[PDB]
Amino acid sequence: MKILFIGESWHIHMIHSKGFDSFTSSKYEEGADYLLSCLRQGNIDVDYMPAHIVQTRFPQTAEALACYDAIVISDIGSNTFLLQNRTFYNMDIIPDALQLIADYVAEGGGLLMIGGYLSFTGIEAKANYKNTVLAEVLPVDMLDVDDRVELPQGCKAVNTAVEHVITQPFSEWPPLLGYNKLIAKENSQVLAEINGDPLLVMGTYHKGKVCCFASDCSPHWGSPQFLQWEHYATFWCNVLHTIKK
Amino acid sequence: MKILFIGESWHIHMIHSKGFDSFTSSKYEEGADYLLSCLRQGNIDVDYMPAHIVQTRFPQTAEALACYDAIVISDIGSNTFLLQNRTFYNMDIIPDALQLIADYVAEGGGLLMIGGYLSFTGIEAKANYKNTVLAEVLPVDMLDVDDRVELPQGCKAVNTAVEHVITQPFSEWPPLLGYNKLIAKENSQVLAEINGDPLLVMGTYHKGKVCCFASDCSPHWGSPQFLQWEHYATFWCNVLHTIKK
Amino acid sequence: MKILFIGESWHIHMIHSKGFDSFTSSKYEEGADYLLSCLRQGNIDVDYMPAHIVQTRFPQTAEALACYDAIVISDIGSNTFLLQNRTFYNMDIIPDALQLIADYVAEGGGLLMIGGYLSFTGIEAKANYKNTVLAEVLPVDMLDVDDRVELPQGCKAVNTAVEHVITQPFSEWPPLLGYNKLIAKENSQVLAEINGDPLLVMGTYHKGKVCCFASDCSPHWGSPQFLQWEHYATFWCNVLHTIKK
Numbered sequence A, B, C: 001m002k003i004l005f006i007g008e009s010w011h012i013h014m015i016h017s018k019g020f021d022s023f024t025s026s027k028y029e030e031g032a033d034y035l036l037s038c039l040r041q042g043n044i045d046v047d048y049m050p051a052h053i054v055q056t057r058f059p060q061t062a063e064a065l066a067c068y069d070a071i072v073i074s075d076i077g078s079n080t081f082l083l084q085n086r087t088f089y090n091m092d093i094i095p096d097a098l099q100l101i102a103d104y105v106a107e108g109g110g111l112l113m114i115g116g117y118l119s120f121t122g123i124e125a126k127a128n129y130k131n132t133v134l135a136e137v138l139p140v141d142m143l144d145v146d147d148r149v150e151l152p153q154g155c156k157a158v159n160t161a162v163e164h165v166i167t168q169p170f171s172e173w174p175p176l177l178g179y180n181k182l183i184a185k186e187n188s189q190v191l192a193e194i195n196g197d198p199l200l201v202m203g204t205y206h207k208g209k210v211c212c213f214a215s216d217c218s219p220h221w222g223s224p225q226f227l228q229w230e231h232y233a234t235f236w237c238n239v240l241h242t243i244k245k
Helices: A033-041 A051-057 A078-082 A085-090 A097-106 A224-228 A232-242 B033-041 B051-057 B078-082 B085-090 B097-106 B232-243 C033-039 C062-066 C078-082 C097-106 C232-243
Strands: A002-007 A011-018 A021-028 A045-050 A070-074 A110-114 A140-142 A148-155 A176-180 A182-184 A189-194 A197-205 A208-213 B002-007 B011-018 B021-028 B045-050 B070-074 B110-114 B140-142 B148-159 B172-180 B182-184 B189-194 B197-205 B208-213 C002-007 C011-018 C021-028 C045-050 C070-074 C110-114 C148-159 C172-180 C189-194 C197-205 C208-213
Touching: A002 A033, A002 A051, A011 B011, A011 C011, A011 C021, A021 B021, A021 C021, A033 A045, A033 A232, A045 A051, A051 A078, A051 A085, A070 A097, A078 A097, A097 A110, A097 A197, A097 A208, A110 A232, A140 A197, A182 A197, A208 A232, A224 A232, B002 B033, B002 B051, B011 C011, B021 C011, B021 C021, B033 B045, B033 B232, B045 B051, B051 B078, B070 B097, B070 B232, B078 B097, B085 C148, B097 B110, B097 B197, B097 B208, B110 B232, B140 B197, B148 B197, B172 B189, B172 B197, B182 B197, B197 B232, B208 B232, C002 C033, C033 C045, C033 C232, C062 C097, C070 C097, C070 C232, C078 C097, C097 C110, C097 C197, C097 C208, C110 C232, C172 C189, C208 C232
Parallel strands: A002 A045, A002 A070, A070 A110, A110 A208, B002 B045, B002 B070, B070 B110, B110 B208, C002 C045, C002 C070, C070 C110, C110 C208
Antiparallel strands: A011 A021, A140 A182, A148 A176, A189 A197, A197 A208, B011 B021, B140 B182, B148 B172, B148 B189, B189 B197, B197 B208, C011 C021, C148 C172, C148 C189, C189 C197, C197 C208
């Protein structure tokens, strides 16, 4: 399978102040190289699209997205898709990128949204997906408020009574350090739950298959133990295959 | 016809980062200056009040606003009214400025609010007009959440079935690139809709007339095509004459 | 009486810009220094715990907090408790600090929360306590949206019919410049109100006593009329004695 994987490294800008004075330091954080590694190890052929490309070169055509068996959006807020540089800084007229994605799913394409601070509703409600059009595509309902459920203690998920390829191979989950609180839509399937809330949900949107994972595939919610985990590489591949065109 | 126009230029402070290092550049983005000239070309005598002046020398009396036939508020959030330098840095007691505006309208004042990231509920719910004395003055209900509807692809508003002098001269709107999502109150008149939502809303507040335009008069929601439109200047002049005292 | 007092000074970072260029200046505001000097000298033994001490060395066992009669949280967001440095930057696993306070209170410890921008729901909803274990502990329900009610004109609180030790010695309040808007829960007693909303709410959490004060013990809501009040010091001492474990 061929997938489009949309994600990015956090940029970090650090102001250091003492008394009157300040200096800065800056750096980056590294996204999901590990998850991308795992996906290349499994069958999967991946096109990584960083947030920068999305902002500057996002495809303007359904056909441009047709060769992908599935799309993944990992911890990028909607603003990034809706306020591309040409829209925000030039006032060119540009296709709704999110509508393209939703159109692409309706024709059989698969979609996976992976949680984090910039997923679903997100920290300070900045991911803001509920107000988008994708809302209608996801097998979940989102909150109005900041989404995060922070779990410094850690908390481990339990699989669901539902039996599924993704979830068959294992039973004990590794600790996760948080997730986006979601509500499952009526006719969707919850495969695991965390702190009583849903963790993995599947639904369809017309012809296409949709999946939400409510925690992050990486730090800090995706704990060292979760990245470690014997089942991590295959879990992710199964999910991808479960939504294949 | 004599009006008080409250608005401003955006200030932009830009942090450029690469590896360890940053440098910064700064500029101003240019506000409603186009609209101001247009009003001046019609009847209208305009007192331009920048948010700087709102912050330092806002009138302390609703009699001081009384020489104005209307007050326009353009994409300036409530914080700017409620947290004048006196109040916020010095704890000096002063009249709630939104209340003076409310009083002013009640005694027959016109009020226009023009949308943007800092109108109504606003980007990230920052403009925050809902939790404000002005919420009952306006002919609209507002969302608890981030208001914005972004239309990178643009969207042409339509005139409603209500007939009006404002909307009389033209049938077809130029595209706009976003608007605040609002709900028309009961006794209010919707003259135009965009994307199935109210664009232009007239109502009353005791003896005063009130208007809500849900998009922006400037970039980036205000498309160039909007700005260059043969009707733009007469539309805004009309809107003002309409809400005159 | 020995209490844990949790708060901080504001750090201020200032970007000054003019045309292209900027420079910066930075400083500190001030925490509850007055209020602390007031609590001591009313023979209250006070451990001051700055955020930062919260962020690096926060008690991780029940035994640790047990030697405290009450805990004071003043103007500190939930993020500071949940996202300590070791969770957020180190990827360690530490226990939920707010479970800790909850546990403590249930075991008969007293809690006081003082309002401000990072209390309750807080400014731009950042304090975020409603999506938190403490929500359950507090004698108030919190809003989904931005909590603040700004009162630049100031408003005098009025005592309630309920007779109480805290409330006897005065009847007229000095003006406050804003507060967090809350709603009293059922089994809870409101001892004072401001602008027709709760200001002093008393309650219990299993074996423990809880108190919410809806305004700030310091600037800018905490007016100079409030700090120079005759009843100021005694008022807080009484609040504390009222929640002594």
